Amino acid sequence: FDPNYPRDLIGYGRHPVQANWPGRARVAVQFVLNYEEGGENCVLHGDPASEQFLSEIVGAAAYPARHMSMESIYEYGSRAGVWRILREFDKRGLPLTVFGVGMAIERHPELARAFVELGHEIACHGWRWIHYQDMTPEREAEHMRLGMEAIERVTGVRPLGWYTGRDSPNTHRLVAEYGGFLYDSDHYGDDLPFWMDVEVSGGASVPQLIVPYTLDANDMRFATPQGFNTADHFFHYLRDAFDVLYEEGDEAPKMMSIGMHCRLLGRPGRFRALQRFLDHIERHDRVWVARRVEIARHWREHHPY
Amino acid sequence: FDPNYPRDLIGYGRHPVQANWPGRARVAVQFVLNYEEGGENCVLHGDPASEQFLSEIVGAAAYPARHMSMESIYEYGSRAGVWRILREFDKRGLPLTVFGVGMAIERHPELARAFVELGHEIACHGWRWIHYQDMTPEREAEHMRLGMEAIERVTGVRPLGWYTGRDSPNTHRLVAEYGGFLYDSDHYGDDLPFWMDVEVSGGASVPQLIVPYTLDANDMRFATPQGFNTADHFFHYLRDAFDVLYEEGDEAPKMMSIGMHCRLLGRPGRFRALQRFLDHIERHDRVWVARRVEIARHWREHHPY
Amino acid sequence: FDPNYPRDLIGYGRHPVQANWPGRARVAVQFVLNYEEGGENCVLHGDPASEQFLSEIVGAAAYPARHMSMESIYEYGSRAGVWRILREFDKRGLPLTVFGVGMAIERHPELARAFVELGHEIACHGWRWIHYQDMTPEREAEHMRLGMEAIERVTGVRPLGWYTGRDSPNTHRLVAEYGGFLYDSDHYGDDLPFWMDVEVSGGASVPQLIVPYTLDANDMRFATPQGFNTADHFFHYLRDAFDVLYEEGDEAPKMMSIGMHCRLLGRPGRFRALQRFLDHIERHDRVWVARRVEIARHWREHHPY
Amino acid sequence: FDPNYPRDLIGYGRHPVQANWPGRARVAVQFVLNYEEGGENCVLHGDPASEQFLSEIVGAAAYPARHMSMESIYEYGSRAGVWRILREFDKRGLPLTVFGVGMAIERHPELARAFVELGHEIACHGWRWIHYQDMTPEREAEHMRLGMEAIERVTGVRPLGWYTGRDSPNTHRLVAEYGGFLYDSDHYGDDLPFWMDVEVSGGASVPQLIVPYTLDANDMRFATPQGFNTADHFFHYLRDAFDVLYEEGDEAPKMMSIGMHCRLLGRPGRFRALQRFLDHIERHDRVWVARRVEIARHWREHHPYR
């Protein structure tokens, strides 16, 4: 049936490959710090309208003007929220991967360099934090270029991972064509990395490593209609996810992503969720807390194409 | 008043019939595993646009294009979530009924045969998982035929139950005209099976056994605006539902359905809900955990038309 | 400022009147059982489209046809949910008031008679359960006549209370012009009854006794965007509201309404909320559990215009 | 990059200034009682349509007519909810700042005077409680004048604080140009006050003290789609927010705002969240429960414009 169908619904099937994580880890835990603030929709950036998504104003209108509430909500993340998250990771000696938006990174260079100073990975989260669904591949390719160049120029580091989020039908192709990415995270389809065959211009295909991310174990759900009400909701969700995976780790260890946003989890009332979750996983043996790039390198070494 | 009114508001009235479940069960528990992944709206399938319903992106837009995030969200169900659910049932030696979308069944034939190998019932959930409200009866009838043929072709099993979900005003009639269905579950109107007089072409009626399903005791509510935040919310709902029914079962035993979706309850952070509920009901005497078709056979034997 | 302004923002001000409830009650608790099922938007009733409001499908579209899922969701209330609620009150020997839709009462006359048999009050909740905001007063007045007459024909009771819910700017005047009501509950503005001056024809005002109702302490919030997720959310809300009122009762006793819908609270998973709340208030001295009409008669005797 | 960019994404950076609150407070807690009821959208007030926002009917339509449910939900706040909140603060001997809507204040003058007699601050929350995003700055400046004048005529107090809420791209400039304000709270960008350079006419900027407010530690979230289901949700969110800040207060004390609405938190079912939170903060040493004007005066004295 439908031999040419361009989606893999089967994956590993019933019995996934043995991850063989370092330290016989039962689960690999991968915290993602999104840094988008300064790169979002804003007429100041030449966008037609103000930002609507992932704010304290759930269901916000877009205006062909500056929306000040929305701007200072985003400014919280870069002014305050980010530092609160970074302090907590530093105090615990734990790494994370920053999904850095290029324009955001240029607007706050001292913070961007603090990320590198703290030893965190920076992956490229696009030049702009905007919806790419309808953008032509020529323009999207231009932004990819601007995004990587911005990050490298400011931090001295060349990202090795890509994640747009609100991507287009072309983004996987554009990542493969640009090349040099050890992983692409625009995928919610599994609990382990795997390889995708990405069709490129000409119709032929090229292997790309996918390191799947998450939209459910993600503080973005504080700003969506179905959405954690309190720190303890997000904490219990993470805790439960971790417990399920950790118990599976005797048979077939998996990975877990945790999605974080400066302007969201950085709020003091939500931040307790991170503290509680870290305390939880610290009680467990055989947990690898890894940079995303470390999981990609591990996969490429142990589970080559 | 309104003698010809074609809805039964009254049902069993204040005193329902005695279920007389096997083993003098106080309640019959019927777990449903929806399998829709591969059958949803997608331009690959010839649909106008991408899927909007029952994902991690609540309030998602439809695009006349492939929506990648939506596709990998669905792929999660077929790749990973399904197996997590099937493992739990298997470990506990419990049966369930699959509401299998024909197209999805065809796209993952090894999994479809695994359902049968594991002893689960497969019912027909339509050829496509698309809204049928506005579809003409000619077109909807063709889909029913395609759905039934697909499932039997792949699994060797002819379904005996029908459930569309987002059905049309004609769907009951189409089930009746097709024939051979021991039960139809397009109904949220009671806590016990019952007989519906279904008007067929010509305007005469034919009895159809209804086994009612559920939109509240259903993990779909993780993806709706009013919607469980954590595993514990879904667990407590099911627990409470069961508890109320179990207490009623000293006087008038009822059934309870539980709706599950691979891409939703199969996520690790939701999955704890199922484990906690199974643990809860395991502690109770006089629980019949049944395949949907076993409940319909029971009713036909003990409560004939 | 604005001498002529026709809203009373002030009410009792800082020190309300002493309620002086029977038995020196600290709080008067008034349960409402809305009975709308069979009176909702349906093309079978000559309405343009299918019901959208207060269902298991939050955000439902309206169709110019029968919406089967919506119909059976409503049928659950008349078929099953109503009897579960009536059993609980009967078992505890407690009264409630029914807010009865005339058409729904006419479609289930045996149940309507059962409400009277069990000693509950029946108040008029309109001829139809539909939005009245945009209706002309000529048309609205006709519906009021039809609702009052339906209820009286079926049950033999002449309602002494009125509640539309989704009312119009004319409804209070219509209730005043109709005459013979002891109270109107189309108001969410206080914790005590109070008297409203309603303008009728001929430049005259007439007093109307308001007994305020509730949109927060109401199971309707299970079907609204901001929405109790579990039974315990609704119980805890009721519990808390009661506790706050009860503590105020040593200085200035108030009343509390609880809103219930057969198709919502009647579901097993929600129903625990009622049981738990009833157990809670049973532990408390000096609680008057009252028919609405009994509160109105008390007010008219002890706190006349 | 983008030298001219008119947003400060950086603020204090990684080490904020030492707040040095009175009493060596670890955290300054600032309760805000919004008073909008009687000032909201209503055809009686000359608006096109009925109110849709911050009610028990979430997702309400607007009607070019009176919407009675919406009117009585709003009247609960002025008839009942307000006195319940005020009783609680009175019993505990605690102050708050009222974000008072000019029109609402004029329609309940005894209550407005009660705010003053109870020792609370009144800040100006606009003449009208409506969306100002699309309003022209001539129109918006006229409302500012009317709001300030109404408050002052009714209560005798000249507000020293401004909060619109649903503001416009011009409101900071309108506040700067009006003069006499000690602070503006139309900002959600930090855990401490700070100074903003506000552009006025003639190519001149003037400094404006911001005392940031909150949209998350706010009972408005009982009336929004992502939104506390019970009293305990709001209490636990406030508790957690306070605990986090209180733990930071050993290195760098910050402030916390708590947003309250008469028609929301004043409901018995919600009100327990306030009581439980106050009980939590009562058990903690070194908490300054402040009027918003007191925090502004503090910053001006200890952290002058830099």
HEC string of D243-302 equals HHHHHHCCCCCEEEEEEEECCCCCCHHHHHHHHHHHHHHHCCCCEEECCHHHHHHHHHHH
Q: Which of C186, C215, C233 sits opposite D56 (nearest CB)?
A: C215
Give the C-alpha separation, C216 to C208, whole Å.
24
* Four-residue CA torsion sign, C233, C239, C242, C248: negative
Which residues in chain A are contacts of D280 at CB distance < 8 A?
A: none
Contact between D223 and D264 (Cβ < 8 Å): yes
Question: What would the two tokens of residue C242 be?
Answer: 């009661």
Contact D237 A223 (CB under 8 A): no
What are chain A's partners, defined as 3 or more CB pairs within 8 angstroms? B, D
Enter the DSSP assignment of B43: G
Which residues in chain C are contacts of D108 at CB distance < 8 A?
A: 9-10
- Give CA angle at B241 (B238, B245), nearest 5°: 135
What string of DSSP letters covers chain A? --TT----S-TTTTSPPP---GGG-SEEEEEEEEE-TTSSS-GGGT-SS---SSSSSTTPPP-SS--HHHHHHHHHIIIIIHHHHHHHHHHHT---EEEE-HHHHHH-HHHHHHHHHTT-EEEE--SS-S--TT--HHHHHHHHHHHHHHHHHHHS----EE--SS--TTHHHHHHHH---SEE----S-SS-EEEEEE-TTS-EEEEEE----SSSBGGGGGSSS---SHHHHHHHHHHHHHHHHHHTTTS-EEEEEEEETTTTTSHHHHHHHHHHHHHHHTSSSEEE--HHHHHHHHHHHS--
Q: Residue D39, Cα to own-chain centre: how many angstroms?
A: 16
Q: Give start and end residues of each alpha helix (H) in D49-136.
A: 68-76, 82-92, 102-107, 109-117
- Residue D42's closest CA among D54, D28, D52? D52
Give the C-alpha separation, C38 to A65, whole Å.
49
Contact D63 C244 (CB under 8 A): no
Contact C226 D230 (CB under 8 A): no
- Mutation to test the B interface, candidates C153, C229, C277, most B Cβ within 10 Å: C229
CA nearest to C248 within chain D: D84
- DSSP SS3 for D92: helix
Which residues in chain B are contacts of A166 at CB distance < 8 A?
A: 69
Question: What would the two tokens of residue D290 be?
Answer: 């402040």
Burial of C241 (0-12, 13-18, 19+ CB in 10 A): buried
- DSSP SS3 for B165: coil
Contact C44 B5 (CB under 8 A): yes
Contact D245 A224 (CB under 8 A): no
Q: Which of C75, C83, C231 sits opposite B7 (nearest CB)?
A: C75
Beta bridge partners of C33: C98, C260
- DSSP SS3 for B157: coil
Q: Which long-range contacts (CB under 8 A, 24 or more apart) does D58-65 make?
A: D58/C224, D58/C225, D58/C226, D58/D223, D58/D224, D58/D225, D58/D227, D59/C224, D59/C225, D59/D225, D63/C133, D63/C134, D65/C133, D65/C169
Q: How far is B226 from chain C (nearest CA, A)?
A: 6
Contact B68 A191 (CB under 8 A): no
Q: Residue D3, Cα to own-chain centre: how many angstroms?
A: 32
Contact A188 B73 (CB under 8 A): yes
Length of chain C: 305
Enter the DSSP assignment of B99: E
Task: Kindly give the pairing relationship between strand A194-199 and strand A205-210.
Answer: antiparallel
Question: Which strand (E) or helix (H) includes residue B280?
Answer: helix B268-282
Q: Which of D11, D171, D233 sits opposite A230 (nearest CB)?
A: D233
Contact between D32 and D259 (Cβ < 8 Å): yes
- Residues near B179 by beta carbon (within 8 Å), at least 6 away in sequence: none
Give the C-alpha separation, C74 to B214, whole Å.
13
CA nearest to A132 within chain B: B67
- Matching residue, tokens 């916390």: D256
Give the C-alpha separation, A230 to A218, whole Å.
13
Q: Which long-range contacts (CB under 8 A, 24 or more apart) does A47-56 make?
A: A47/A130, A53/A223, A54/A220, A54/A223, A54/A261, A54/A263, A54/A264, A55/A223, A55/A263, A56/A223, A56/D188, A56/D215, A56/D216
**Buried-state track D117-134, b at ≥16 Cβ within 10 A, e below 16:** eeebbbbbbbbbbbbbbe
Q: How far is C33 from chain B (nearest CA, A)?
A: 17
- Matching residue, tokens 């189409």: B174
Angle at which helices A231-248 and D231-248 cross, to 10°: 90
Contact A225 B269 (CB under 8 A): no
Which residues in chain C are contacts of D58 at CB distance < 8 A?
A: 224-226
What string of DSSP letters covers D5-52? ----S-TTTTSPPP---GGG-SEEEEEEEEE-TTSSS-GGGT-SS---
Contact B227 A226 (CB under 8 A): yes
Enter the DSSP assignment of D78: I
Task: Kindly give the pairing relationship between strand A121-124 and strand B97-100.
Answer: unpaired
Q: Residue B153, Cα to own-chain centre: how many angstroms?
A: 21
Enter the DSSP assignment of B302: H
Amino acid (1-letter code) at residue C224:
T
For chain B, how many helices (H) and strands (E)? 9, 9
Give the C-alpha separation, D187 to C268, whole Å.
46
Task: Kindly give the pairing relationship between strand B205-210 and strand C183-184.
Answer: unpaired
What are chain B's partners, defined as 3 or more CB pairs within 8 angstroms? A, C
- Residue A162's closest CA among A200, A124, A195, A130? A124
**Buried-state track C93-127, b at ≥16 Cβ within 10 A, e below 16:** ebbbbbbbbbbbbbbbeebbebbeeeebbbbbbbb
What are the distances in angstroms from CA C195 to CA B126, C119, C254?
58, 27, 15
Beta bridge partners of A255: A28
- Residue D84's closest CA among C251, C5, B40? C251
- Residue A36's closest CA among A68, A73, A88? A73
What are chain D's partners, defined as 3 or more CB pairs within 8 angstroms? A, C
Enter the DSSP assignment of B285: S
Question: What would the two tokens of residue B232 be?
Answer: 């514990």
Which residues in chain A are contacts of B44 at CB distance < 8 A?
A: 5-7
Question: What would the two tokens of residue B15 be?
Answer: 């005193």
- DSSP SS3 for B126: coil
Question: What would the two tokens of residue D92 be?
Answer: 């505990």
- Mutation to test the B interface, candidates A5, A10, A228, most B Cβ within 10 Å: A10
Give the C-alpha separation, A58 to A69, whole Å.
12
Question: What would the two tokens of residue C40 be?
Answer: 């909702």
Domains of chain B, CATH where assigned: 1-305 (3.20.20.370)
Contact B75 A6 (CB under 8 A): no
Question: What would the two tokens of residue A259 be?
Answer: 């999605």
Which residues in chain A are contacts of D228 at CB distance < 8 A?
A: 229-230
Contact between A234 and A269 (Cβ < 8 Å): no
Method: X-ray
Q: Which of D12, D168, D227 sits opposite A79 (nearest CB)?
A: D12
Give the C-alpha separation, B80 to A190, whole Å.
6
- Give CA angle at C211 (C205, C215), nearest 5°: 120
Q: Which of D5, D191, D243 sits opposite A80 (nearest CB)?
A: D191
For residues A205, A18, B115, B186, the Cα torsion angle rounded to the nearest 10 degrees is: -70
Give the C-alpha separation, D23 to D221, whole Å.
32
- Residue A211's closest CA among A13, A24, A19? A19
- Mutation to test the D interface, candidates A44, A56, A218, most D Cβ within 10 Å: A56
What string of DSSP letters covers B46-87? T-SS---SSSSSTTPPP-SS--HHHHHHHHHIIIIIHHHHHH
CA nearest to A222 within chain D: D226
Q: How far is D267 from chain C (nearest CA, A)?
A: 8
Amino acid (1-letter code) at residue D5:
Y
Give the C-alpha separation, C106 to C147, whole Å.
9
3-state secondary structure chain C: CCCCCCCCCCCCCCCCCCCCCHHHCCEEEEEEEEECCCCCCCHHHCCCCCCCCCCCCCCCCCCCCCCHHHHHHHHHHHHHHHHHHHHHHHHHCCCCEEEECHHHHHHCHHHHHHHHHCCCEEEECCCCCCCCCCCCHHHHHHHHHHHHHHHHHHHCCCCCEECCCCCCCCHHHHHHHHCCCCEECCCCCCCCCEEEEEECCCCCEEEEEECCCCCCCEHHHHHCCCCCCCHHHHHHHHHHHHHHHHHHCCCCCEEEEEEEECCCCCCHHHHHHHHHHHHHHHCCCCEEECCHHHHHHHHHHHCCC
Question: Which strand (E) or helix (H) includes residue B269?
Answer: helix B268-282
- Matching residue, tokens 């078992």: C91
Question: Which strand (E) or helix (H) includes residue D206?
Answer: strand D205-210
Contact between C256 and C60 (Cβ < 8 Å): no
- Phi first, then psi, for residue C277 (nearest 5°) are -65, -40
Burial of B252 (0-12, 13-18, 19+ CB in 10 A): middle
Amino acid (1-letter code) at residue D164:
T
- DSSP SS3 for D216: coil
Contact A268 D1 (CB under 8 A): no
Which residues in chain B are contacts of C108 at CB distance < 8 A?
A: 9-10
- Phi first, then psi, for residue A34 (nearest 5°) are -75, 140
- DSSP SS3 for B177: helix
Amino acid (1-letter code) at residue A47:
D
Length of chain B: 305
CA nearest to B58 within chain C: C59
What are the distances in angstroms from CA C247 to CA A235, C16, C27?
34, 15, 9
Amino acid (1-letter code) at residue B230:
T
- Residue D260's closest CA among D286, D282, D287, D292? D292
What are the distances in angstroms from CA A1 to CA A170, B66, B109, B295, C39?
26, 20, 9, 34, 48
- Matching residue, tokens 């996987």: A172
- Mutation to test the A interface, candidates D240, D256, D276, D280, most A Cβ within 10 Å: D240
CA nearest to B133 within chain C: C67
- Residues near D141 by beta carbon (within 8 Å), at least 6 away in sequence: D174, D177, D178
Q: How far is B160 from chain C (nearest CA, A)?
A: 21
What string of DSSP letters covers B208-256? EEE----SSSBGGGGGSSS---SHHHHHHHHHHHHHHHHHHTTTS-EEE
Which residues in chain C are contacts of B228 at CB distance < 8 A?
A: 229-230
Q: How far is A58 from chain B (nearest CA, A)?
A: 12
Contact between D233 and C237 (Cβ < 8 Å): no
CA nearest to C192 within chain D: D80
Which residues in chain D are contacts of A267 at CB distance < 8 A?
A: 216, 241
Which value in Å is the resolution of this experimental model?
1.9
What are the distances in angstroms from CA D107 to CA B235, D34, D117, D149, D305?
49, 15, 18, 14, 38
Contact B231 A245 (CB under 8 A): no
Give the C-alpha separation, B265 to B274, whole Å.
8
Give the C-alpha separation, A202 to C195, whole Å.
79
Angle at which helices A137-155 and A109-117 cross, to 10°: 70
Q: Which of A133, A189, A237 sits opposite B63 (nearest CB)?
A: A133
Contact D68 C169 (CB under 8 A): yes
- Phi first, then psi, for residue A19 (nearest 5°) are -65, -35
